[PDB]
Design a protein around this motif. Structure first.
Motif, PDB file in Angstrom:
ATOM      1  N   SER A  39      75.260  25.640 -94.614  1.00  0.00           N
ATOM      2  CA  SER A  39      76.225  24.896 -95.418  1.00  0.00           C
ATOM      3  C   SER A  39      76.436  23.487 -94.874  1.00  0.00           C
ATOM      4  O   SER A  39      76.510  22.518 -95.643  1.00  0.00           O
ATOM      5  CB  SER A  39      77.547  25.656 -95.486  1.00  0.00           C
ATOM      6  N   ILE A  43      75.654  19.893 -96.739  1.00  0.00           N
ATOM      7  CA  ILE A  43      76.649  18.830 -96.870  1.00  0.00           C
ATOM      8  C   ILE A  43      76.135  17.525 -96.270  1.00  0.00           C
ATOM      9  O   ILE A  43      76.273  16.454 -96.871  1.00  0.00           O
ATOM     10  CB  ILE A  43      77.981  19.259 -96.231  1.00  0.00           C
ATOM     11  N   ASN A  44      75.535  17.590 -95.083  1.00  0.00           N
ATOM     12  CA  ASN A  44      75.062  16.391 -94.403  1.00  0.00           C
ATOM     13  C   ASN A  44      73.700  15.918 -94.892  1.00  0.00           C
ATOM     14  O   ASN A  44      73.297  14.800 -94.559  1.00  0.00           O
ATOM     15  CB  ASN A  44      74.999  16.631 -92.895  1.00  0.00           C
ATOM     16  N   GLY A  45      72.983  16.732 -95.661  1.00  0.00           N
ATOM     17  CA  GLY A  45      71.696  16.320 -96.178  1.00  0.00           C
ATOM     18  C   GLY A  45      70.581  16.273 -95.164  1.00  0.00           C
ATOM     19  O   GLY A  45      69.589  15.576 -95.384  1.00  0.00           O
ATOM     20  N   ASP A  97      67.912  19.019-100.852  1.00  0.00           N
ATOM     21  CA  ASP A  97      68.193  18.092-101.946  1.00  0.00           C
ATOM     22  C   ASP A  97      68.592  18.831-103.215  1.00  0.00           C
ATOM     23  O   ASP A  97      69.518  18.412-103.919  1.00  0.00           O
ATOM     24  CB  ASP A  97      66.978  17.209-102.216  1.00  0.00           C
ATOM     25  N   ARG A 100      72.088  20.103-102.776  1.00  0.00           N
ATOM     26  CA  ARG A 100      73.036  18.997-102.838  1.00  0.00           C
ATOM     27  C   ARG A 100      73.259  18.542-104.273  1.00  0.00           C
ATOM     28  O   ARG A 100      74.385  18.212-104.660  1.00  0.00           O
ATOM     29  CB  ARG A 100      72.538  17.840-101.974  1.00  0.00           C
ATOM     30  N   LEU A 101      72.194  18.507-105.075  1.00  0.00           N
ATOM     31  CA  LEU A 101      72.344  18.138-106.479  1.00  0.00           C
ATOM     32  C   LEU A 101      73.157  19.176-107.242  1.00  0.00           C
ATOM     33  O   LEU A 101      73.986  18.823-108.088  1.00  0.00           O
ATOM     34  CB  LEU A 101      70.973  17.952-107.125  1.00  0.00           C
ATOM     35  N   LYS A 104      77.426  19.671-106.377  1.00  0.00           N
ATOM     36  CA  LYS A 104      78.371  18.672-106.857  1.00  0.00           C
ATOM     37  C   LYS A 104      78.576  18.740-108.357  1.00  0.00           C
ATOM     38  O   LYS A 104      78.961  17.739-108.971  1.00  0.00           O
ATOM     39  CB  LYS A 104      77.900  17.272-106.464  1.00  0.00           C
ATOM     40  N   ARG A 105      78.329  19.899-108.957  1.00  0.00           N
ATOM     41  CA  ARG A 105      78.240  20.031-110.399  1.00  0.00           C
ATOM     42  C   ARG A 105      78.995  21.279-110.829  1.00  0.00           C
ATOM     43  O   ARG A 105      78.875  22.330-110.196  1.00  0.00           O
ATOM     44  CB  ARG A 105      76.771  20.095-110.819  1.00  0.00           C
ATOM     45  N   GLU A 108      80.245  24.524-115.957  1.00  0.00           N
ATOM     46  CA  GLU A 108      79.914  24.202-117.340  1.00  0.00           C
ATOM     47  C   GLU A 108      78.699  23.291-117.429  1.00  0.00           C
ATOM     48  O   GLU A 108      77.911  23.401-118.373  1.00  0.00           O
ATOM     49  CB  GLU A 108      81.110  23.550-118.034  1.00  0.00           C
ATOM     50  N   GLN A 109      78.538  22.381-116.466  1.00  0.00           N
ATOM     51  CA  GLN A 109      77.389  21.484-116.463  1.00  0.00           C
ATOM     52  C   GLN A 109      76.119  22.181-116.002  1.00  0.00           C
ATOM     53  O   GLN A 109      75.019  21.778-116.395  1.00  0.00           O
ATOM     54  CB  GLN A 109      77.667  20.280-115.567  1.00  0.00           C
ATOM     55  N   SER A 146      64.823  18.061-106.560  1.00  0.00           N
ATOM     56  CA  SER A 146      64.704  17.137-105.436  1.00  0.00           C
ATOM     57  C   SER A 146      64.237  15.762-105.902  1.00  0.00           C
ATOM     58  O   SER A 146      64.809  14.732-105.516  1.00  0.00           O
ATOM     59  CB  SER A 146      63.746  17.704-104.393  1.00  0.00           C
ATOM     60  N   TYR A 149      66.920  14.038-107.801  1.00  0.00           N
ATOM     61  CA  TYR A 149      68.055  13.664-106.973  1.00  0.00           C
ATOM     62  C   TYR A 149      67.775  12.423-106.140  1.00  0.00           C
ATOM     63  O   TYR A 149      68.645  11.556-106.016  1.00  0.00           O
ATOM     64  CB  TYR A 149      68.437  14.834-106.061  1.00  0.00           C
TER      65      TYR A 149
ATOM     66  N   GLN B   4      78.035  17.791 -87.889  1.00  0.00           N
ATOM     67  CA  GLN B   4      77.620  19.100 -88.381  1.00  0.00           C
ATOM     68  C   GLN B   4      78.688  20.157 -88.128  1.00  0.00           C
ATOM     69  O   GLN B   4      78.910  21.031 -88.972  1.00  0.00           O
ATOM     70  CB  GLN B   4      76.295  19.503 -87.740  1.00  0.00           C
ATOM     71  N   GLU B  15      83.441  16.222 -96.889  1.00  0.00           N
ATOM     72  CA  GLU B  15      83.046  15.565 -98.131  1.00  0.00           C
ATOM     73  C   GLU B  15      83.912  14.342 -98.410  1.00  0.00           C
ATOM     74  O   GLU B  15      83.406  13.298 -98.848  1.00  0.00           O
ATOM     75  CB  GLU B  15      83.117  16.550 -99.295  1.00  0.00           C
ATOM     76  N   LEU B  18      82.701  11.567 -96.172  1.00  0.00           N
ATOM     77  CA  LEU B  18      81.445  10.992 -96.648  1.00  0.00           C
ATOM     78  C   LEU B  18      81.676  10.047 -97.823  1.00  0.00           C
ATOM     79  O   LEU B  18      81.082   8.960 -97.887  1.00  0.00           O
ATOM     80  CB  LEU B  18      80.470  12.103 -97.033  1.00  0.00           C
ATOM     81  N   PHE B  49      85.078  18.522-118.498  1.00  0.00           N
ATOM     82  CA  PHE B  49      83.715  18.656-118.999  1.00  0.00           C
ATOM     83  C   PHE B  49      83.419  17.617-120.071  1.00  0.00           C
ATOM     84  O   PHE B  49      82.342  17.006-120.077  1.00  0.00           O
ATOM     85  CB  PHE B  49      83.492  20.068-119.538  1.00  0.00           C
ATOM     86  N   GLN B 168      70.548   6.795 -97.785  1.00  0.00           N
ATOM     87  CA  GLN B 168      71.532   7.754 -97.302  1.00  0.00           C
ATOM     88  C   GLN B 168      72.195   7.185 -96.061  1.00  0.00           C
ATOM     89  O   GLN B 168      71.510   6.842 -95.093  1.00  0.00           O
ATOM     90  CB  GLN B 168      70.886   9.105 -96.989  1.00  0.00           C
TER      91      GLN B 168
END
Lengths: 249, 208, 228
Positions: A39, A43-45, A97, A100-101, A104-105, A108-109, A146, A149, B4, B15, B18, B49, B168
């Motif tokens: 996790s 978050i940090n990518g 990636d 991460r994409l 954040k969604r 419904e999306q 990926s 994103y 981390q 978050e 960031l 939405f 990034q």
């Protein structure tokens, strides 16, 4: 005794233990640490230089896959995804990636995204893309996510996914099949040598195999077999599952 | 001290930090984040939405390449700026024009050869500076543009001979489809490369 | 702890001889005083609990003329300077009491002032009844290793008959005690360590493998092979 027997005994005691027992509490630190590692990496990518808990849990899974899938399904599914990516030769940054994409969604999306991706796939002209198996479709979706994103281009993501999948997979066809496709197999799973060009030989051995099984079992539904690649094996299977043949490299 | 660990233990604060870091690097005050949160919090899950769909449709219908094919990470900050302007006034057209003008003059979109949509990444201009002078952003872009051409020549096996360019934090990543080719740049390395190029050019001019 | 362990293998005594020679104090007296104050115990826990070999107090530590206001709230924790200061104080006490009087110097135990001067006067008169119980016991504990003109008058004080000898509490109550039932043998924990099968290495991409085995990419191969 050798270390394998010790691991077998420890896993027997772990399996026989109750839900809140001490054996499950000792190994629960491993699972908590592995989940936190993944996790935090999402978050940090970026994956940290050391992930001792994930490596330990993956080795324990390699010792006993069914026990880990029974006790910790989330880590088991993550390890299966990582295994498929590793066999395709794809770095975990792609999975990071894609996660991460997606994270954040909203819910419904995500439905709209899934519908759009499936519509884009079904409208393709290449047989490998329009009639892709679900297990391959998951990795394809991760690659597409990926690329979509790290840039903003969905057309670029689609073309990259399609080109990657065209030149690394092979679609098998059957005689008088609606849609003509009976399976899609990665090319490097059909290699008979260390030379990649040998993938053509292993395909032939496969293509004569499914013709030989149909002749030996004419009672099957439409004289048709499905070809499915799972892990490191290829399965030839009929509709009822009574005819099942396994191949490997 | 330890990113981390904080992301593992307290994801919400990680978050938030960031997001604040990205705004700080763009030069944006936290009042914008406060306004965007205030606009969003007073709104139900069914309306959110619709708002997201409307914003994405407005972006995809734009004519500027930087807006129509914006990366998601940049799209979050763009949405916050748009929400702040749309919250402090009632004008959505003003909010759209303010966002588009802010993003046009502070970001640069990289293009590739024979790419559907032609866009391979969007990078803020101040992350490509080789000096303290903002106009130097054009030099750091050149060093980047020759980099992705040099990597593709060294690794011709990549999918479509294409790389994505992604900013990034304080770094810029050149990456292929499989992730096996990954190259990192930052302002220190860009400055060093520019200084070496300047030294070579000036010595060639002097001794020839 | 019985009989002070005179001939026990001397633990951490590489400091008493040097202090004794520097200040002139007897080695036996200094070692016995250190044993009485702390029993050479590294923790030495009490109401104040100075873990040093010379179990001082804050008032005495500051009055000794040291720099006690340093380190872990007290500077007299390093053994050597504390032992040297104690030896200097003992030598000054012994010298100031008209000769080698090694027991009146046990004003070290009681000090000089409102509670120590009358006891020292009573000792000078030889009237042990006016000395406190703590002082009398502390001097009794040092009779074996001490040189005093009144060492024989103190031992014949408190006898059951005038020809008897008094009994120090270290002898009358010797041997009476109970063992501790708790030991420092801790329970040990074990790690759940299962070292399974190592994970297979990440493969090369098919296109990269093709381009490395053959000096050309898949696209070039397909274009060239499809020409004819």
């Amino acid at each position: 005794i050798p270390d394998g027997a010790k691991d077998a005994m420890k896993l027997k005691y772990l399996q026989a233990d109750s839900k809140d027992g001490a054996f499950r509490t000792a190994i629960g630190t491993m699972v908590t640490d592995a989940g936190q590692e993944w996790s935090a990496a999402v978050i940090n990518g970026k994956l940290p230089e050391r992930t001792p808990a994930m490596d330990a849990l993956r080795r324990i899974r390699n010792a006993d896959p069914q026990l880990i899938a029974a006790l910790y399904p989330d880590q088991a599914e993550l390890f299966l995804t990582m295994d498929m990516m590793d066999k395709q030769g794809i770095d975990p940054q792609v999975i990071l990636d894609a996660d991460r994409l997606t994270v954040k969604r909203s819910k419904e999306q995500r439905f709209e995204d899934d519908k759009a991706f499936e519509s884009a796939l079904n409208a393709s002209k290449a047989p490998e893309i329009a009639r892709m198996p679900a297990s391959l479709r998951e990795s394809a979706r991760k690659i597409y996510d990926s690329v979509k994103y790290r840039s903003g281009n969905e057309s670029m993501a689609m073309e990259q996914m399609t080109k990657f999948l065209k030149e690394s997979t092979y679609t098998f066809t059957g005689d008088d099949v609606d849609g003509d496709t009976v399976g899609v197999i990665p090319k490097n799973m059909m290699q008979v040598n260390s030379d990649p060009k040998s993938w053509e030989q292993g395909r032939d051995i496969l293509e004569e195999a499914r013709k030989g099984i149909i002749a030996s079992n004419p009672w099957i539904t439409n004289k048709q077999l499905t070809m499915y690649s799972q892990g490191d094996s290829i399965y030839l299977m009929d509709t009822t599952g009574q005819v099942r043949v396994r191949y490997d490299k | 001290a330890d990113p981390q660990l904080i992301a593992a233990l307290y994801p919400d604060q990680a978050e938030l930090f960031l997001t604040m870091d990205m705004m700080d690097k763009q030069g944006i005050d936290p009042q914008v984040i406060l306004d965007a949160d205030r606009l969003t919090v007073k709104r139900s899950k069914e309306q959110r939405f619709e708002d997201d769909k409307a914003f994405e449709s407005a972006l995809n219908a734009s004519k500027a390449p930087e807006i129509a094919r914006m990366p998601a990470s940049l799209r979050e900050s763009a949405r916050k700026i748009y929400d702040s302007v749309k919250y402090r006034s009632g004008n959505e057209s003003m909010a759209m024009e303010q966002m588009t003008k802010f993003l046009k003059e502070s970001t640069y979109t990289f293009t590739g050869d024979d790419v559907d949509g032609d866009t391979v990444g969007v990078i803020p201009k101040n992350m490509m500076q080789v000096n303290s002078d903002p106009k130097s952003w054009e030099q750091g872009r050149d060093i980047l543009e020759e980099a992705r051409k040099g990597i593709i020549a060294s690794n011709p096996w990549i999918t479509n001979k294409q790389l994505t360019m992604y900013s990034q934090g304080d770094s810029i990543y050149l990456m292929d489809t499989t992730g096996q080719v990954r190259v990192r740049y930052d302002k220190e390395l860009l400055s060093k490369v520019w200084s070496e190029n300047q030294k070579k050019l000036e010595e060639k001019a002097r001794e020839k | 702890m019985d009989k002070y362990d005179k001939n026990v293998p001397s633990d951490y005594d590489g400091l008493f001889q040097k202090a004794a020679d520097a200040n002139g104090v007897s080695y036996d007296l200094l070692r016995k005083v250190a044993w009485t104050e702390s029993r050479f115990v590294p923790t030495a826990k009490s109401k104040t609990g100075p873990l040093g070999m010379m179990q001082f107090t804050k008032a005495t530590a500051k009055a000794l003329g040291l720099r006690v206001t340093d380190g872990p709230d007290d500077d007299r924790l390093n053994p050597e300077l504390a032992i040297n200061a104690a030896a200097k104080q003992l030598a000054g006490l012994v010298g100031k009491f008209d000769g080698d009087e090694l027991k009146a110097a046990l004003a070290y135990n009681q000090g000089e002032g409102r509670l120590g001067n009358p006891q020292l006067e009573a000792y000078s008169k030889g009237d042990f009844a006016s000395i406190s119980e703590e002082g009398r016991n502390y001097m009794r504990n040092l009779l074996d290793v001490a040189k005093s003109p009144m060492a024989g008058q103190l031992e014949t004080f408190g006898g059951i008959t005038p020809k008897g000898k008094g009994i120090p509490a270290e002898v009358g109550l010797a041997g009476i005690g109970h063992k501790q039932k708790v030991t420092q043998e801790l329970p040990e924990s074990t790690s759940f360590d299962v070292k399974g099968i190592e994970q297979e290495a990440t493969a090369k991409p098919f296109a990269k493998d093709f381009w490395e085995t053959h000096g050309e990419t898949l696209d070039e191969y397909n274009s060239r092979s499809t020409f004819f």
